[PDB]
Design a protein around this ligand. Sequence first.
Ligand SMILES: [Zn+2]
Length: 166
Amino acid sequence: SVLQVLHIPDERLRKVAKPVEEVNAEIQRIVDDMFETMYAEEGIGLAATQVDIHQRIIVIDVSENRDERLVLINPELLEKSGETGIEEGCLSIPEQRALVPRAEKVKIRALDRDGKPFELEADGLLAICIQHEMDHLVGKLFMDYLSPLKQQRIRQKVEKLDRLKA
Ligand SMILES: [Zn+2]
């Protein structure tokens, strides 16, 4: 079932998510709920923090056919290298896009939907997405990389956007 995505400014988006102790039926319901929300909104990824569930859970789908589900529970970065960047967007920062500096290659270790571990070597958009979604788990948004002036403009714009759409 579709969940509500928090927009800035909301302090809840800055709460550090805690590690999932045991992957079970509940955790899995959340995973499916998260995928439903992400597909509903046409997003390519979604961190649990965005839907107000403070646990280390991420769902991703960077495929054209939008049928390739990637689940990262308790992700952990092991390696990262190179430089890249794209006009990133976020469902928590409606209508704002900004070029953010990211590592091109990224190697991670996580748990899947069934609580079994795997390691993944990613590059391209998938690597960028993962760094984006992991920042979300530690209360960091893509706007924190910009200059304070640009950040302030963003908050003004979203603040306005939301109030007028209510
Ligand atoms: Zn985001």
